[PDB]
Amino acid sequence: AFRTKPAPVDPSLQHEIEQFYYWEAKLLNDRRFQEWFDLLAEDIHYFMPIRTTRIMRETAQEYSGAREYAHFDDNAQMMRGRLRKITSDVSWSENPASRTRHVISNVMIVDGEKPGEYHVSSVFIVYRNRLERQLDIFAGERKDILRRTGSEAGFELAKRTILIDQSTILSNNLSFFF
Amino acid sequence: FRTKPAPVDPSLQHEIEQFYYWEAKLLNDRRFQEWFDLLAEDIHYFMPIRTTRIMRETAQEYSGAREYAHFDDNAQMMRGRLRKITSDVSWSENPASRTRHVISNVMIVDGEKPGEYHVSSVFIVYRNRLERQLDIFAGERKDILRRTGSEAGFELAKRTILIDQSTILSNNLSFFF
Amino acid sequence: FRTKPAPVDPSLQHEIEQFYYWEAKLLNDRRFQEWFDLLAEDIHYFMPIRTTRIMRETAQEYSGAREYAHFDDNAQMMRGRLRKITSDVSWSENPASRTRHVISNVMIVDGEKPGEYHVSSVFIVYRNRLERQLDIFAGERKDILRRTGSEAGFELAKRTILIDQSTILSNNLSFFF
Amino acid sequence: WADADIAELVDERTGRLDPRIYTDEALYEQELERIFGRSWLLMGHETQIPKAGDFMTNYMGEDPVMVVRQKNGEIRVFLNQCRHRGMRICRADGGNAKSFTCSYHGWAYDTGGNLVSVPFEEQAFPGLRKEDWGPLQARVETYKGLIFANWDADAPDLDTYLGEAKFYMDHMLDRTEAGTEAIPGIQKWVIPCNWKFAAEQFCSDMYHAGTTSHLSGILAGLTEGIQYRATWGGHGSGFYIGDPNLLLAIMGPKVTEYWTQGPAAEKASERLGSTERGQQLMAQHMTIFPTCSFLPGINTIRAWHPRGPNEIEVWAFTVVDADAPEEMKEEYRQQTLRTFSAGGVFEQDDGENWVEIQQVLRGHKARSRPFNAEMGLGQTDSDNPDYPGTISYVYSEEAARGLYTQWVRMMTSPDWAALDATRPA
Amino acid sequence: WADADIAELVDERTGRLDPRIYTDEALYEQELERIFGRSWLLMGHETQIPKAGDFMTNYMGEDPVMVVRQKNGEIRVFLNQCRHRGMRICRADGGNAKSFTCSYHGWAYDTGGNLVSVPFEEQAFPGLRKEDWGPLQARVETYKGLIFANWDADAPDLDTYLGEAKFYMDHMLDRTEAGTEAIPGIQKWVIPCNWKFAAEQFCSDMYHAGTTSHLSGILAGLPTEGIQYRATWGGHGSGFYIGDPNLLLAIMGPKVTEYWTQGPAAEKASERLGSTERGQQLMAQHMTIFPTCSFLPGINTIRAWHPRGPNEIEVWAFTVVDADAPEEMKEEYRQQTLRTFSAGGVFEQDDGENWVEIQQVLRGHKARSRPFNAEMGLGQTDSDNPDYPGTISYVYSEEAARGLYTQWVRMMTSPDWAALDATR
Amino acid sequence: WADADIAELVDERTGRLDPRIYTDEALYEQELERIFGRSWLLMGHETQIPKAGDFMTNYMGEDPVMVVRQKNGEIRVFLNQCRHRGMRICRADGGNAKSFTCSYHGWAYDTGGNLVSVPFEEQAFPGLRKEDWGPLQARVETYKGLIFANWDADAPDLDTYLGEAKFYMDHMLDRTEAGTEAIPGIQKWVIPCNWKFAAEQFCSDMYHAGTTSHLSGILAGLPTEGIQYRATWGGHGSGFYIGDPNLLLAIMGPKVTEYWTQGPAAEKASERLGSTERGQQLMAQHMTIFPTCSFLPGINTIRAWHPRGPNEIEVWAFTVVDADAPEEMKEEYRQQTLRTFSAGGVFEQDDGENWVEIQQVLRGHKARSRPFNAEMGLGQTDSDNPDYPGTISYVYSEEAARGLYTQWVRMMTSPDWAALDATRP
Ligand code: FES
Ligand code: FES
Ligand code: FES
Ligand SMILES: [Fe+2]
Ligand SMILES: [Fe+2]
Ligand SMILES: [Fe+2]
């Protein structure tokens, strides 16, 4: 998948997928959550495994697996409920709202198995500031499957795996989206 | 940026990304004269104060046009700042801070006048100074860039810095975003 | 990078970015044998010590050629660092740290020889280890990349890391920039 | 702090809490000695370390420990600190080992934490008795899958420590002959608040869920009950009876149905000797003092680990009946992470509240007047035939007053003999 | 700390300051009790919350407070803390509300911070007198647009606390019958230094501005006589140049300098202040109202310093203008203040750099082991100046500063306001 | 802390160290007064500031100082603090200064740290004697190129402070009539551990290098006899292998190892040291000059540890070379030292990881409740060795470490140098 170096892609494709991520970041950072949730595919799997500190010979166990506890591991129904909460005036974690920034780079694209689909690796810094002085800085990789669509966004998010560069979460909550 | 920007030619995307990468080098390597030269005669360099609001009052999140701000400067005001920062007696920046302007998420929309472009981009600014001082900032920059015949290719006609802070987590704002 | 780089072909910009993006993956996913294979036999991997100077002595900001440095390594030295980091008795990286190399601001200029490129880029390196350790670095990398017949497309012939720190805000530098 | 000064900080008669209990560093350090140093604390579940050599790290206060399965089935808990110069013996979170070697000077340990060799022992350590120089060992006892540890030889055993609270624990832990198992994976995160806010809330506070804290959580998933305060020991639990609304909103229709109708729930009623206990309890919260908390039905369980007075870590995992269908285990997995986790639609808000309370307590005037803990004062029944202990309506702070009273007792007792003398006749 | 030991930390007779007053944690806790707990503290300006239900948060020391306009015109200040389990009643910076509800267990408050309902009150809280369980209320008094608060019922009223310092405040606040207003917007930033550096600087320190601190700021604004007031009692101070517009021109530019010194608005100021010197010939002024209210009449930046331990403060600053100033003048004040006396301003950029370095050096043992020199202008005073009340010095002096640190001693060694009145 | 309470924290007779010496904040404040306030502390090397006006900053404890070459060739060290309101006088790390001006109110200083002018002096400071209002001056003395400073006029002079330890320093500093010089460049980094771990390790701990700490460092570069010096008084210590080049070749490579043991430079070293063993058969040496000056003769890294509270230090390191070594050997020393004993070096990378974990574990109450084992080599000493002065032990011992912690007790329990000198034998 990203086992060997991705073949070169058309500059058109690189730019199209990059613009998709930059627009997605704008939706999240500007709290356009209705439009963000509309980017999610009906078959969305939104996954953020728990990461542990291991010695070398046991690094296969670094991430939680498929039937194991996780930070996020959601289908569309679960995510729809999260949208209902984060657009709510009695949602105390996000009212008042956090100020977030999603700085996206290192976009690498590989043709998926079905036409119109793409495997994408990219990296992020998420900077989250709230209330008076609270500041959490996150980084990680996002491994996505994007699927081309006729929405103004132009893709939908079929699959996301967030690989967070933290073991213990250095934040009191994870009340936003990666 | 109310609607998703239409696709643009790769050459345009690359040209304005290069303008920002070059601008960042000038700032980060303390080439301030060259940086100030990017600014148009009609520059409005604006950084509203951001507050924490409940949902039904988030239209008041940012200070407005006749309200106090972190920056809200014209060309004459910016020229004064250039005088300061190139001074052996400007203590906040002698010794100089070490800055890094990591720029990404560049989205471009044609302006209402030809030769002009609306640009949204995001940043991490990392400012380290003295022995161990470290301030890390993030935000959006909403620019209007205008074509010129200069080597840089554009002048900065307008910038609004939307900072992801309410209370500023720095003892000063002695550098430029 | 004394003057603003001329425009380059979009395909060149894209393949060099892809070089760095792939490099970042190799480092961040601990594919260290593959990373070290990117280095040319004439590799000079250099990270000078940086000091806080007043304006008139900023030429002394970075440690020079025959001066102490954070890194200043040839191929044989780097080969030893690979040998340390791929054993199971290397305690600083077993258990392994988690790193993220966020790369941006890539600017490319033709080198003096065909097949060689001068590249400036910036980074945030995010390094988290054990339970709660967090070190966040930024800087510039100034590289010479050289065309090769490998899958990777280039080898790294020279790297100078310019770190935005004076005192290093970390207990070690046990990874690669 | 003198004993009599600490006792004045809490008044279960009038219902008053002095807010300095959540901020004072001297009290905090005394809590590490007198509470965490001699209480039974949750280490996890037996099924997290089933095989010989399986280990996981954990905390007893701010002492890091190794929890390790031995060759004879035994679970040992020992300080993760080499006695030579203090190096952490193992830096991994978990795995399987045949031994542990200190990376500093190579003192080597078996899986039981015994020091078994020292490099150059013959020349440089002629007299050394290795059997006296291994890391401190905690007492380890289980209760129905849960592992607890306690450093103190003179503490009561786990069964006595839990006492009558076992009854309320069994609603989660004893519903089937197969027992429970932990779903693998432990979520760990950092909240800048005092441990006692968390401990109290899971001990006593259905009020917050029944009012405003979780309106948004309820929406994302779209009156009667009792509360138990331990006769002695600071444990508490509360639960709704008959009304499925909070349970359905938290865990969805599949889990709700598994918890109340059909064979598994009927088995629960049989084992617990009551249809009410097995099938009509809906959303229960519980704290085993000081810092083990869980929600029977939802089936999240966690240890709170103190990090000074202004910070905790939450270490959470989910347990399921070992004989539940695979589809039910998967539903428990997703619905718990969806709700009672760092990013969960309930627990997201639990920690925003705690964080703001603690930041306000920076203020001098904010620490200068008592908090109101008078809710349900005198509205108790210590002679309920179905429910042991002191019983209140589900909306009350009786259990909370009990937790803060146990806090006073531990904090003012130099040893367990003195603490045993505060027990009722 | 014993009272006599605190008194030895400051010596106004020989002019010595012990640097541990800026670092000691125990002294800091006692400041929160004996200074911030019973002083009048700046909450803002009336025109920031002009309508019923308008609120803004602020701080009294490290106690967060709500400042709220009531239906009867009243301004209430109360602790932003629910007495149930301590939750912050309101988590936004400002806005307009008809009530406030605690998010934790739903206890509900009117806009005055009275507790008006408690969910399930009848069953669970039978004997509850809600009127005794609302958050602590501060006393509120205004002075010509400024709002101050004070927790202590036994403190003097605002008018008496300010005393003769009112004279010097009036240079900013009483120039017109229409009063002042706040330009909307409050800048907040964090400086790792002790509050007393900032308070003292605005109390007493024209010297720093007349020497090296702001050479670069003065330069950015371009192409000797003055006095200093020390309050007879109370720790207030103010200084200003007389006659020479160079610092004012350099900071605020030609349009503001002309408005401040010439034409109908300045002549009206001269009339209301009974002096052409007061109205038209005062040329940049600094002032502190003890402990932490500071402002610069003419520039018209005003701020509260909020302590955050001995090693940190927040600055919350805003700008005031005459309400009847032309719109072009209000705008000019807006732009020039932000250009100069703000986190990124060409003056205050440098004040923040100095303070941060002082505080870091004070980690050192020897750095804390010898006194700072506070002897500037010792004995060169006149407390019977016919035109200016108080103790009057040359503009370059530390007499006002000595007064500030003496008031610190007095408050720090008085168990209540009766003991403090005995030092008058 | 009472003096007798402090003395009980360390026991050189039985070999015990109470871990609270590494964590307690009250003890730390007393270390700044009674250790860092009156010890000789490393400022650097004379060749770092060769010309009039040349300066570099440094620390004495947490007091920032200026180290400045004077017009007459002397070196001054003075507090980097203006006595007016405490502003740092110079904010640059080093360079060549004409003079210094306080940025706050413009008080001006010459390069000797003398206050030479004060704006508006005539009108606002009529009495002021500027010669009495300059920053505190430290004593400054050198030993074979190394600059040390000490605030206390009652301390012994540097020669006496070093005493018999000079012998062991000379292995690095006295190999040639040309003396040493510093390679330009000082690396500074931050390690969250107590200073005593670092000072101890370089004083006494060849054991960590001969066991597991540096297996990986050794492998990256591709031992049985030796002795350890414990100072009769003063807390200094040094150890070294004799005969076998294996630790030296793995660290520094064959060119340096050859330069150190064979040929004209090494033979000259043996002559000046009066011994072939001292000059040519000494292989990897470690040393600390108490409290916080450490170096590795042969490798030729030298550093100061700067305390940053009990839970943090800074390391400020540089490399020294023989001033007459060929240019290629100077280059080899530069590359090999930065390769090995630096933040990113293949040896020291691992030292910083160990110390950090020790300190973090010590947050724990039980982790601080029992002594560390410091019995290695107890009683296996020779205080009458003919070729090596002081108290000599096998290379694997903690005798020097016991000496270091005994000196710590002596300083910490002495109100002044008179009381300290009275602890001498
Ligand atoms: S610290 Fe464990 S062997 Fe030395
Ligand atoms: S904390 Fe406010 S209602 Fe409970
Ligand atoms: S602090 Fe140095 S002159 Fe005032
Ligand atoms: Fe591109
Ligand atoms: Fe809750
Ligand atoms: Fe100033």
Ligand SMILES: [Fe+2]
């Ligand atoms: Fe080592």
